[PDB]
Amino acid sequence: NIKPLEGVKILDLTRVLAGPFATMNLGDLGAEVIKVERPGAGDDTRTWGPPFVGTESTYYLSVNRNKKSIAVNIKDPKGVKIIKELAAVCDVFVENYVPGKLSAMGLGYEDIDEIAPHIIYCSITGYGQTGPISQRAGYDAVASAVSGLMHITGPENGDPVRPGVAMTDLATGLYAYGAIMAGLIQKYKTGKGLFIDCNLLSSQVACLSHIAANYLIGAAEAKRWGTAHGSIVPYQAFKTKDGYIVVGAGNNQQFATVCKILDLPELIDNSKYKTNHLRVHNRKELIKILSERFEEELTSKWLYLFEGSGVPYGPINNMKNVFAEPQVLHNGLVMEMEHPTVGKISVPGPAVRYSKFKMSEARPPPLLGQHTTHILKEVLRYDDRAIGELLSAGVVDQHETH
Amino acid sequence: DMNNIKPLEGVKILDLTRVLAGPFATMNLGDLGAEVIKVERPGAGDDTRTWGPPFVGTESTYYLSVNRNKKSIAVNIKDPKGVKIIKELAAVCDVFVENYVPGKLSAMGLGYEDIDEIAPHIIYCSITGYGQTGPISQRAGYDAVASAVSGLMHITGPENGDPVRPGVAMTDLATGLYAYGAIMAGLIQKYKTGKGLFIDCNLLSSQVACLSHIAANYLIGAAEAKRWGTAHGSIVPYQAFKTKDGYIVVGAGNNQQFATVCKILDLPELIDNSKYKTNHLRVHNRKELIKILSERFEEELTSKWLYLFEGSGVPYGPINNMKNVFAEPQVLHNGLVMEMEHPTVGKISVPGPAVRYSKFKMSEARPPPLLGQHTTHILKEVLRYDDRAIGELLSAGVVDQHETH
Numbered sequence: 013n014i015k016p017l018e019g020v021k022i023l024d025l026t027r028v029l030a031g032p033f034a035t036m037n038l039g040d041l042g043a044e045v046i047k048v049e050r051p052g053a054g055d056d057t058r059t060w061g062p063p064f065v066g067t068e069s070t071y072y073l074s075v076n077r078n079k080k081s082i083a084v085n086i087k088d089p090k091g092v093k094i095i096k097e098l099a100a101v102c103d104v105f106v107e108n109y110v111p112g113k114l115s116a117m118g119l120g121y122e123d124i125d126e127i128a129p130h131i132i133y134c135s136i137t138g139y140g141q142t143g144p145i146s147q148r149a150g151y152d153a154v155a156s157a158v159s160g161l162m163h164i165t166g167p168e169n170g171d172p173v174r175p176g177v178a179m180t181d182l183a184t185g186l187y188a189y190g191a192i193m194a195g196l197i198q199k200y201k202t203g204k205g206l207f208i209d210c211n212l213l214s215s216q217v218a219c220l221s222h223i224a225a226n227y228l229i230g231a232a233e234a235k236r237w238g239t240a241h242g243s244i245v246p247y248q249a250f251k252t253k254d255g256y257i258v259v260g261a262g263n264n265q266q267f268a269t270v271c272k273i274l275d276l277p278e279l280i281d282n283s284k285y286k287t288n289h290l291r292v293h294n295r296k297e298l299i300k301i302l303s304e305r306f307e308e309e310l311t312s313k314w315l316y317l318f319e320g321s322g323v324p325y326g327p328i329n330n331m332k333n334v335f336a337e338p339q340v341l342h343n344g345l346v347m348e349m350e351h352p353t354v355g356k357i358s359v360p361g362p363a364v365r366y367s368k369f370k371m372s373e374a375r376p377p378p379l380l381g382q383h384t385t386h387i388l389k390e391v392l393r394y395d396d397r398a399i400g401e402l403l404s405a406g407v408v409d410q411h412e413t414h
Numbered sequence: 415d416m417n418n419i420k421p422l423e424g425v426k427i428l429d430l431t432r433v434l435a436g437p438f439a440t441m442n443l444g445d446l447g448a449e450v451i452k453v454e455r456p457g458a459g460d461d462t463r464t465w466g467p468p469f470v471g472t473e474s475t476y477y478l479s480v481n482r483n484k485k486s487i488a489v490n491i492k493d494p495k496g497v498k499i500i501k502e503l504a505a506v507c508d509v510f511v512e513n514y515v516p517g518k519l520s521a522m523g524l525g526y527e528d529i530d531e532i533a534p535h536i537i538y539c540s541i542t543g544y545g546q547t548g549p550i551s552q553r554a555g556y557d558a559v560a561s562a563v564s565g566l567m568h569i570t571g572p573e574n575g576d577p578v579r580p581g582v583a584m585t586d587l588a589t590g591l592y593a594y595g596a597i598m599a600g601l602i603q604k605y606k607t608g609k610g611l612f613i614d615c616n617l618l619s620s621q622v623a624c625l626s627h628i629a630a631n632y633l634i635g636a637a638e639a640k641r642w643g644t645a646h647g648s649i650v651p652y653q654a655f656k657t658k659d660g661y662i663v664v665g666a667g668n669n670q671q672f673a674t675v676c677k678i679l680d681l682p683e684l685i686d687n688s689k690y691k692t693n694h695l696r697v698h699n700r701k702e703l704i705k706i707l708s709e710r711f712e713e714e715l716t717s718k719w720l721y722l723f724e725g726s727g728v729p730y731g732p733i734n735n736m737k738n739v740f741a742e743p744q745v746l747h748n749g750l751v752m753e754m755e756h757p758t759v760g761k762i763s764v765p766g767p768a769v770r771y772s773k774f775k776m777s778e779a780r781p782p783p784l785l786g787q788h789t790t791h792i793l794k795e796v797l798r799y800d801d802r803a804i805g806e807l808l809s810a811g812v813v814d815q816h817e818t819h
């Protein structure tokens with residue numbers, strides 16, 4: 013009934029994806045997310061379209077549910093005053109500007125910690141708070157290139173490729189969303205806050221893990237394999253009559269299973285393919301033989317023949333197949349929300365499910381400045397007199413829809 | 415140590431995970447100070463122990479990369495006495511993590527229902543391929559399969575080419591990060607309720623959620639997605655460009671940045687070109703523009719372009735290999751090369767923690783444990799077994815103790 017983060021206020025100055033994705037997941041867990049946006053423009057994702065639904069872009073809608081919106085010009089001293097007043101009654105402070113940018117505006121950790129020594133201050137940057145290239149802005153495609161992910165992603169004999177989605181941004185967001193709750197836990201015993209440094213470079217290098225460990229320990233360089241792997245064969249995507257199927261065999265018994273299903277038992281006892289080490293050594297000839305067979309049948313036929321095989325196998329699905337998959341719908345991944353002016357909209361739902369509470373009901377993504385007046389009056393106790401003055405000056409903006 | 419108090423100190427994690435997703439989650443919790451008790455099969459242990467070469471002594475680099483800051487107890491959970499040991503551990507542990515097919519541990523007497531009965535406080539987190547229930551929930555989880563079924567592979571690869579998978583198991587790692595955050599959400603919730611709960615993380619749910627805007631385009635606009643190689647559908651130019659000896663990523667997020675790039679490339683005539691004057695026009699005329707830019711990028715070395723782009727203020731970066739990654743001073747500056755002293759294998763280096771906190775240090779880590787290295791210590795220190803009961807369990811084969819303690 014009650015979510016674990018209920019009663020936790022998050023002062024959210026994040027933009028784009030990495031930061032907003034972190035605060036969206038905390039909003040799913042019950043946190044009161046107060047999104048601070050530029051009057052007029054707002055979060056950059058608001059203008060990235062088409063596709064557009066009414067006035068809201070699908071980019072913005074996808075990662076900003078379960079948030080409230082206050083449009084405040086934080087470059088204005090009156091806006092800085094509002095941010096500091098909000099931080100004093102908030103538990104978490106999140107931003108993803110270049111290091112020192114918020115500090116130059118009077119909203120750095122030193123400034124905020126002075127008036128909110130309890131606060132958890134989390135900064136999401138491209139390369140960290142300090143260092144030779146720490147002043148560069150963070151970008152997923154740039155980080156995945158510098159961190160080594162792109163070099164190991166792509167066709168074996170082709171150009172490097174990027175993940176279809178900004179996995180480096182999302183991974184960093186997941187690091188931060190966990191780190192913020194670790195800060196809260198630490199705060200619960202000590203009563204004081206701390207500063208958290210998340211960045212795209214650190215997140216992606218850490219995710220290299222064993223691949224990077226192979227070099228740091230064995231001086232082994234990594235390479236691109238397309239859909240295959242360097243140390244285990246066969247294990248890749250195979251072109252079928254109408255699509256692709258991923259199939260793998262991690263040992264001689266799985267390899268026998270695959271060959272029998274493919275009606276190629278003669279390969280099991282062939283001297284070239286009897287062990288995994290030999291299959292890797294003879295991978296080009298083996299994959300060619302297997303690929304010729306895979307392409308003769310439809311994907312649906314191969315999926316039926318592999319039922320109960322006990323080997324890793326799965327079809328390569330497009331968006332149409334993904335959301336026709338009964339398992340996808342079963343997991344609640346099609347989250348529907350009622351937008352006040354745009355109507356019913358559907359986005360990918362929460363990835364984690366808990367037994368003691370439900371997250372299937374989410375507040376729709378806020379309109380720009382939708383909750384400006386509500387926050388100033390209810391959260392900061394501003395009177396109608398002061399709010400009208402800030403509105404008249406343009407320091408804050410209130411959407412027509414409340 | 416005295417002043418370096420980590421947030422999760424005093425939290426015990428009963429860790430039955432294997433492979434990558436689960437172990438990655440519990441390793442990050444160990445970095446934060448949690449006491450991770452890794453439960454392993456006697457003799458074999460975690461599957462990754464045998465995944466080699468590369469090998470360092472007897473330990474595989476795969477296993478070492480994601481098992482620091484853990485202790486190892488080798489116990490046979492198929493033995494009724496072993497089930498007893500696991501239940502006794504759960505009673506004094508805060509978290510229980512497993513990544514078996516749904517229902518497997520339940521058939522062994524170690525399901526959530528069984529554990530919650532004797533440990534109503536426990537945070538029970540199961541990491542599966544597709545979730546605890548559903549038509550295909552009984553299939554084992556694999557990163558390559560999940561990325562195929564989830565749609566990531568379909569949208570990853572060269573434009574007009576075959577699908578590709580991420581170089582590393584990002585679906586497993588994303589799921590691991592989801593779980594490592596979810597577990598701490600459970601801990602926080604326990605502060606209020608005093609009770610535990612069950613957590614369902616799976617590869618399919620994690621990856622579909624990461625589709626975000628791409629999925630919304632279909633769910634809302636019925637629009638199908640495509641592969642773009644390294645470029646993007648809504649912003650041009652922004653992709654990887656082949657240089658004379660490698661690749662460099664360069665982008666222009668607005669007309670002013672596009673002018674900056676053109677001047678650096680000695681192509682000022684493009685700034686006022688009717689086909690490329692705005693981003694909307696550059697996207698529409700992307701094919702011809704990229705060819706013109708690609709022709710120039712290929713004439714100079716990556717080192718030359720990096721020098722010419724200094725201070726440009728536009729998004730740019732080289733495509734680094736492992737050698738370039740760990741020669742980059744920024745990477746070393748962030749402490750990402752974590753060195754550890756293994757008791758039998760010696761000094762080893764792995765990627766360090768990604769997050770840095772101002773109130774504590776995580777640069778000093780316990781090396782990944784040897785199989786059953788801490789069996790006796792855990793039984794005596796954590797469960798209060800005496801020397802005779804422990805000796806009987808060793809003689810009976812219920813548990814195993816490594817030569818190194």
Ligand SMILES: CCCCc1nc(Cl)c(C(=O)O)n1Cc1ccc(-c2ccccc2-c2nnn[nH]2)cc1
Nearest residue numbers: 028029071074150151152153177178626627665667
């Ligand atoms: C010159 C760079 C132009 C823009 C920009 N400014 C920065 Cl900063 C970044 C960065 O964070 O990389 N970007 C690129 C970028 C743009 C959009 C998104 C995004 C937003 C919401 C929902 C999903 C996604 C997404 N899902 N999959 N891919 N995108 C994410 C990243």
Ligand SMILES: [N+]
Nearest residue numbers: 028029030181
């Ligand atoms: N971002």
